[PDB]
Ligand binder design. Structure first.
Ligand SMILES: OC[C@@H]1O[C@@H](O)[C@H](O)[C@H]1O
Ligand SMILES: [Ca+2]
Ligand code: NA
Length: 1082
């Protein structure tokens, strides 16, 4: 429909930069610095009105056209220059491309009776300067109008006409011809031939493409004859540009952000034309385009004044959501003159079809004060914030072109180069300074370090500011021209020390928002402590600048400037400064989180403590929980409310069970005092679940102690009641190692785990080799297949021990104990056969309990436990068992997965509300089933279950964890009604007898933990389920992982698609959601 702005962010015109934080890596590069007094090729021979640039990319080179008069706008002479560059930093000297044209003596106007032209030079004015033809030829174009005095209009449509000439591959120009004649002008009374007279047949064809193209005719409306038939839309809307939307339609922008649409390539435009709603724009033009990443961007002055120069982003070319800085400086205007006004202005980029710069970034040409010519480069995909602190070695970079993390303001006479290891700042400019900004993650506690060297101590200045997102400097450090390194405390400064030329100084600055101070160390010695002169919430930028900041101009300055400044062409004596090894760090508790911040999710914990009473308090009370969470949890977000809420609830629930005991932390299952628990109310049944979920906690002291408390909490040794429940806890300890990477912790647990395995082996094998367990001792009393006081061979314990044997064998390889590897290796092989041969029911095609005489002939949730440890072959015969996930006669029920198949006669026939396992949904089981389903779908060639099927069950598991409208994780629930079956009894509250966040992280987000240094993800969120999602602040293998998906690129602004970040640096990428693997990035 129409271009519009919906962002809340505004630009404040009492500041030069608007209090807009810039986007990352924007380089401001001055191309032309006016100097009347010392005219030269490189400044267009001392002309001081230089304005209205145009840009194109052709044969790997930038082409930059600007126009100039000697001093005053619409005061002759007047010409148009051309400039080139391979990289966009180092430019060739301005070359006169359209020279001054003679107005015929005796020219007149209706609006100027009695006046008539004598020896009068034409004024030039184009809204459009370039065209790449279909045959790859580059045509540049200009217009000549007439001004009989300074108050006259040469874009009145009584002009002379429009000229063109070819720019050739070799640099040289072709001849100059007219392409359009204003009324009363023709071949007979003009100084260049008509374009058609050229004998270059293809040059004519190229010129003719411009006339035939209606999108170019839209840009001639201002200068051309009024009502000329070749102008598609005849109303005089100003400085047209346009771009192609994703659907093929063309959107347009003119001055004051007027905007339309065209569904026929530019012949017609949707009435009524109106301002883009929510945009802030005036005279100084707006520029929009598509970018290499397929998104869009607008560049404009968001102000009735012509400052700052800003960028707003859009994913669809219509709805613009952001507003940040491109150019916030304002060189003061050296040379006065007619209609010149302060600030960066007339932004204009590359039309569609006229070039793609090889680096894929956004380059935009603009003037400053109608005086100096500039270009800015903005890295695409455009990034707002720094995903990673500084650790910059400049010797790795050949030229500033490669410093995509630094923002650079670089005037001609205050340039920014590299000198190997050093980022260098030169300043011989009285009216300007060199400035570099380094944007970093917004931080409350901040350390910043770098080496600093001056080339002098008797001249110039350097200011070091520490800014927030609204450009508030919280303190400043200064190298003074009277030889001192000092800090700003308030109005008063503090002299920290003297300084010397040519000497490296290691500067470290330690800033704290909370404490509201800065400490400055130089060579390990503290040399200054002051308070902030201005308070901030966070610091996001360090700025190095070769000058004091400039107060002029302001919103109250008069727009017209009659004066030149004193010594306008002169120079300061050269000052140099150098910096190297810029490091930053933060002690903030979520500093490891690359994109998400805990403050945006702190509300979840707040809601949970407010929503209901705190019945039982153990080590971490509710009042400290929000805080514990910040320190310990990976952050997650997605567009779906329930999944997100559950993510934060299951950590907030889990933490209640961290319990203080004399021998260390332990992890409870019931909060209430159970009659049969061991010491400290501990229960062994779900230790597997506890470890699998708690391994993602970042502070290891909790899980370290919880484990040690089981195996060593009872006079040095194991707790007694590990004899009471079957265990997969050796697999679970090796599951922990796969997430934290800590060999030592694990290898230390090996004997304790061998003791355990061997105990179960002595006590609980039948004579054929299979393990037996009574259904009670699996934690599954009154199960259908069963066995209260029975020694049936249940696929639970048999699979748990397969897992344990497999685990201990691996611990053997890593121990260096090749005997233990083998011994437990064969224990693994053996149990794998006994399950595959003796427990596969061949009628049912399903793993099932074997009673003393034959199979129990009932499919239960336990029949999916062999895949919890990847027990089965990849053969197709087993795939069929997973069909029962999607069958309402099997396990598919309204609120998730049943514990037994629903088709069975005996399903849920042993009463209710006393913990029965003959059908009802048990989170314990559901989590075993989903972990196994995850393993199936990840590690097996497999056609039975889609992404959608996995997601469905996790979604149902989310929906099931509510009670009275609030989140709730109870013991067990009704498969049809969703009723938690102990009701409002206290004992079921916050029950810790399952996983959820392991499932979120390992199945859904699909971070697959491994023994080695490959990172493997494989989300089971289906294509198009969610426009974005992100798992951040994960402590995998002593490195900080972020995993994110951004369909349109507009959620995180770091690219489209799926991405892995290790410590905030990208490690891999994928256009869709599939398996994405990053080798050796740890
Ligand atoms: O069915 C739940 C039982 O009670 C819990 O204490 C144990 O985990 C399990 O044996
Ligand atoms: Ca200066
Ligand atoms: Na701001």
């Amino acid at each position: 429909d129409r271009i519009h702005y919906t962002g809340k962010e505004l630009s404040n015109p009492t500041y030069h930069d608007g209090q807009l934080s810039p986007v990352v890596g924007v380089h401001n590069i001055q191309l032309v610095r006016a100097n009347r007094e010392h005219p030269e090729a490189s400044n267009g021979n001392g002309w001081t009105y230089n304005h209205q640039p145009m840009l194109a990319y052709w044969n790997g080179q930038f082409y930059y056209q600007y126009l100039a008069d000697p001093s005053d706008e619409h005061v002759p002479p007047s010409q148009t220059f051309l400039m080139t560059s391979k990289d966009g930093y180092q430019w060739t000297n301005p070359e006169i491309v359209f020279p001054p044209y003679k107005v015929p003596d005796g020219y007149t106007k209706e609006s100027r009776p009695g006046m008539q032209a004598k020896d009068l030079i034409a004024i030039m004015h184009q809204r459009v300067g370039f065209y790449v033809s279909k045959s790859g030829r580059l045509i540049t174009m200009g217009n000549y109008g007439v001004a009989l005095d300074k108050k006259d209009d040469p874009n009145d449509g009584n002009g002379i006409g429009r000229v063109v000439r070819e720019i050739k591959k070799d640099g040289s120009f072709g001849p100059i011809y007219f392409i359009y004649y204003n009324h009363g002008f023709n071949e007979k009374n003009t100084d260049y031939p008509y374009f058609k007279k050229s004998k270059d047949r293809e040059f004519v064809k190229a010129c003719q493409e411009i006339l035939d193209n209606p999108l170019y005719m839209m840009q001639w409306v201002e200068e051309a004859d009024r009502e000329d038939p070749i102008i598609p839309l005849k109303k005089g809307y100003k400085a047209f540009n346009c771009y192609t939307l994703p659907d093929g339609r063309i959107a347009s922008l003119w001055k004051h952000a007027l905007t339309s649409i065209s569904e026929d390539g530019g012949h017609t435009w949707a009435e009524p034309v109106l301002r883009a709603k929510g945009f802030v724009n005036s005279n100084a033009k707006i520029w929009g385009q598509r970018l290499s990443d397929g998104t869009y961007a607008t560049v404009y002055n968001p102000s009735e004044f012509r400052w700052p120069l800003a960028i707003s982003l859009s994913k669809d070319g219509l709805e613009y959501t952001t507003l940040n800085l491109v150019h916030g400086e304002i060189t003061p205007m050296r040379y006065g003159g007619n209609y010149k006004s302060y600030g960066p202005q007339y932004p204009r980029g590359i039309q569609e079809g006229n070039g793609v710069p090889a680096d894929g970034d956004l380059w935009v040409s603009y003037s400053v004060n109608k005086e100096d010519m500039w270009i800015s480069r903005i890295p695409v995909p455009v990034q707002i914030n720094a995903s990673a602190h500084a650790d910059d070695d400049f010797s790795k970079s050949g030229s500033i072109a490669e410093l995509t993390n630094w923002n650079i303001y670089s005037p001609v006479w205050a340039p920014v180069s590299l000198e190997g290891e050093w980022l260098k700042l030169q300043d011989k400019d009285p009216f300007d300074y060199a400035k570099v900004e380094r944007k970093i993650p917004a931080s409350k506690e901040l350390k910043v370090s770098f080496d600093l060297s001056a080339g002098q101590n008797d001249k110039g200045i350097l200011q070091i500011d520490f800014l927030d997102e609204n450009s508030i400097a919280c303190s400043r450090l200064e190298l003074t021209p009277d030889g001192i390194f000092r800090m700003k405390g308030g109005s008063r400064f503090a002299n920290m020390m003297n300084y010397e030329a040519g000497k490296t100084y290691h500067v470290e600055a330690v800033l704290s928002t909370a404490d509201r101070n800065i400490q400055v160390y130089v060579d390990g010695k503290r040399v200054g402590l002051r308070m902030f002169y201005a308070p901030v919430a966070t610091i996001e930028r360090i700025v190095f600048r070769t000058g004091e900041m400039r107060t002029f101009p302001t919103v109250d300055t008069p727009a017209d400037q009659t004066y030149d400044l004193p010594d306008a062409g002169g120079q300061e004596p050269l000052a140099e400064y150098r910096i190297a090894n810029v490091k930053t760090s933060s002690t903030d508790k979520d500093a490891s989180s690359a994109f998400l911040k805990y403050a945006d999710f702190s509300h979840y914990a707040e809601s949970f403590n407010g929503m209901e009473d705190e019945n039982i308090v153990q080590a971490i009370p509710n009042a400290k929980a929000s805080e514990w969470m910040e320190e310990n949890i990976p952050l997650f977000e997605c567009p779906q409310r329930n999944f997100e809420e559950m993510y934060y609830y299951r950590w907030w629930s889990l933490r209640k069970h961290i319990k203080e005991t004399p021998v260390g932390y332990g992890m409870t299952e019931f909060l209430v005092q159970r009659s049969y628990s061991d010491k400290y109310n501990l229960i062994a049944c779900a230790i597997g679940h506890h470890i699998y979920e708690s391994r993602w906690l970042r502070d290891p002291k909790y899980l370290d102690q919880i484990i040690h408390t089981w195996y060593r909490g009872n006079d040095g040794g194991p707790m007694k009641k590990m004899d009471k429940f079957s265990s997969w806890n050796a697999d679970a300890v090796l599951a922990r190692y796969m997430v934290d990477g800590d060999k030592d912790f694990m290898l230390d647990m090996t004997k304790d785990l061998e003791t355990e395995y061997q105990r179960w082996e002595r006590t609980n094998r039948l004579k054929n080799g299979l393990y037996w367990q009574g259904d009670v001792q699996d934690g599954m009393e009154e199960s259908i297949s069963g066995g209260r006081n029975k020694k049936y061979a249940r696929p639970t314990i048999n699979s748990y021990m397969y897992g344990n044997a497999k685990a201990l064998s691996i611990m053997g390889i890593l121990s260096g104990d090749e005997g233990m590897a083998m011994r437990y290796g064969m224990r693994a092989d053996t149990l794998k056969s006994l399950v595959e041969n003796d427990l596969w029911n061949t009628r049912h095609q399903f793993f099932e309990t074997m009673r003393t005489d034959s199979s129990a002939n009932v499919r239960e949730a336990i029949g999916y436990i062999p895949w919890y440890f990847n027990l089965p072959d990849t053969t197709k015969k087993y795939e069929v068992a997973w069909k029962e996930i999607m069958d309402e006669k099997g396990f598919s029920a309204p609120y998730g997965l049943t514990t037994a198949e629903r088709r069975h006669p005996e399903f849920r026939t042993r009463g209710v509300g006393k913990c029965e396992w003959d059908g009802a949904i048990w989170p314990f089981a559901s989590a075993q089933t989903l972990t196994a389903m995850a393993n199936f779908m990840n590690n097996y060639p497999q056609t039975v279950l889609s992404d959608s099927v996995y997601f469905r069950q996790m979604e149902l598991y989310v929906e099931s964890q509510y009670h009275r409208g609030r989140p709730y994780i109870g013991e067990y629930l009704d498969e049809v009604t969703g009723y938690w079956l102990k009701g409002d009894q206290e004992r079921s509250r916050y029950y810790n007898h399952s996983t959820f966040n392991d499932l979120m992280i390992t199945g859904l987000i699909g971070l697959r933990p491994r023994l080695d240094d490959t990172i493997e993800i494989n989300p089971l969120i289906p294509a198009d389920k969610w426009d974005w999602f992100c798992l951040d602040n994960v402590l995998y293998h002593g490195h900080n992982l972020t995993i994110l998906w951004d369909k349109n690129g507009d959620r995180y602004h770091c690219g489209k698609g799926l991405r892995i970040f290790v410590n905030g640096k990208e490690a891999g990428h994928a256009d869709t959601l599939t398996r994405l693997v990053c080798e050796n990035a740890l």
